[PDB]
Paper text:
Formation of active HIV-1 reverse transcriptase (RT) proceeds via a structural maturation process that involves subdomain rearrangements and formation of an asymmetric p66/p66′ homodimer. We utilized the isolated polymerase domain, p51, rather than p66, since the initial subdomain rearrangements are largely limited to this domain.
The fingers/palm/connection FPC1 contains the same palm subdomain deletion used in our previous studies of the p51 monomer. Although crystal structures were obtained for both FPC1 and FPC2, the FPC constructs did not crystallize readily, perhaps due to the dynamic behavior of several loops.
Author numbering: 5 to 88, 94 to 218, 231 to 240, 318 to 417
C-alpha cells in the first residue's frame, strides 16, 4: 500500500509523559485488548529503547459493558502538524441528531513508519511483575488529530452512496464520531440510522450504539479563536456554565442537573457536565472548549478517570 508522511510542528519533539497508575480492573482489560490488537498487527510490542510515552487508560461508554482503550493523545496532538469541510450551521437546527462512534475505521489505514514511535504507551504491570507492557501503533490510532484528517478521503467515499440517496440528512464528523441529523419523525430517523450502520458495516465499520440528541430545543463567534467554558457549582446536584471567547461576551449559558443515582460526588458530576457541554459545543461550533473547572488539580487528576465515558479528552485548567 502507501502511507501519508506526517511531521511534528517545527522545533517540537514527541511526547514523554509518565503513565499514571490504574486499577487492576483497567490493567486486566488493557492487556486483553492490546493482546488482540498485537495479533492483528494494529500495534507492536516495544521496549525502553523508545523514549516517548503517552498515558493510556480504559473506560466504558454510557450504558455499555465493553471496556474501550483510551490513549490521552492530547500532548501528541498539540505537537502534531496542522492539516490542510466547514461546519454545518444546519446541524443544531435538526429535530434529531445521532452520534456514532466510527473510530474502528482507522485501523485499516497504516501509519507513516517514521511517525509510529511517537504513539508509544505503557500498560502498567499488576503486582509489578514487569516494568510495564509497551506498544506503539502501526495504523491510524483513535484519538490522534491526524487520524480523521488522513482517513477523510476514505470516509467521504464510504459515505458517498448513502448521502446521494438522503440529501435531507446531515452527516458531520468530529474526531472519531459521526453526527447524523434529520428533521424526520423519530421512527423514520431511527431506521435511516440503521440503514447508515448497515452500509458502514458492509465496509467493515462496526458502530457502538449511538447517543441520540435533539438540538432544536436547546435554547459573535470567531472560529479562529478557542472556546472557553467556565463551570460553577450551585448545590443540590446543580451546576451552571458559560461558554465564551472574550470574557464579557458570553455566547451560551446553561445549567446542568446531575444524573440521578445513589453513587455521586462532585468529580463524577463535573465529568458529566464537561461531556454534555463539549457535546453541545461540537454540534453548535465544531470545536471543543477549554474548560475552567471549579476543583483542585490533584483531586481531579486522582479521580476523573473513574467516571470518564468519552473517547476524547478536552483541555482543562483548575483553581
Amino acid at each position: 500500500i502507501e502511507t501519508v508522511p506526517v511531521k511534528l510542528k517545527p522545533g517540537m519533539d514527541g511526547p514523554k509523559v509518565k503513565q499514571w497508575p490504574l486499577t487492576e480492573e483497567k490493567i486486566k482489560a488493557l492487556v486483553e485488548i492490546c493482546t488482540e490488537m498485537e495479533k492483528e498487527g494494529k500495534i507492536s510490542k516495544i521496549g525502553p529503547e523508545n523514549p516517548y510515552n503517552t498515558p493510556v487508560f480504559a473506560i466504558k461508554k454510557k450504558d455499555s459493558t465493553k471496556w474501550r482503550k483510551l490513549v490521552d493523545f492530547r500532548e501528541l496532538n498539540k505537537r502534531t502538524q496542522d492539516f490542510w469541510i466547514p461546519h454545518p450551521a444546519g446541524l443544531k437546527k435538526k429535530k434529531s441528531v445521532t452520534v456514532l462512534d466510527v473510530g474502528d475505521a482507522y485501523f485499516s489505514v497504516p501509519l507513516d513508519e517514521d511517525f509510529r514511535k511517537y504513539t508509544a504507551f505503557t500498560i502498567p504491570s499488576i503486582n509489578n511483575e514487569t516494568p510495564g507492557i509497551r506498544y506503539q501503533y502501526n495504523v491510524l490510532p483513535q484519538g490522534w488529530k491526524g487520524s480523521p484528517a488522513i482517513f477523510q478521503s476514505s470516509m467521504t467515499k464510504i459515505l458517498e452512496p448513502f448521502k446521494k440517496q438522503n440529501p435531507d440528512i446531515v452527516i458531520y464528523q468530529y474526531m472519531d464520531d459521526l453526527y447524523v441529523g434529520s428533521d424526520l419523525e423519530i421512527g423514520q430517523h431511527r431506521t435511516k440510522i440503521e440503514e447508515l450502520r448497515q452500509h458502514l458495516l458492509r465496509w467493515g465499520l462496526t458502530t457502538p450504539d449511538g447517543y441520540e440528541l435533539h438540538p432544536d430545543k436547546w435554547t459573535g463567534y470567531d472560529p479562529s479563536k478557542d472556546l472557553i467554558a467556565e463551570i460553577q457549582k450551585q448545590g443540590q446536584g446543580q451546576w451552571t456554565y458559560q461558554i465564551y471567547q472574550e470574557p464579557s461576551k458570553n455566547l451560551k449559558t446553561g445549567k446542568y442537573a446531575r444524573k440521578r443515582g445513589a453513587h455521586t460526588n462532585d468529580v463524577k458530576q463535573l465529568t458529566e457536565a464537561v461531556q454534555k457541554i463539549t457535546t453541545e459545543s461540537i454540534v453548535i461550533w465544531g470545536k471543543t472548549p477549554k474548560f475552567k473547572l471549579p476543583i483542585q488539580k490533584e483531586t481531579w487528576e486522582t479521580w476523573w478517570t473513574e467516571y470518564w465515558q468519552a473517547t476524547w479528552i478536552p483541555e482543562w485548567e483548575f483553581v
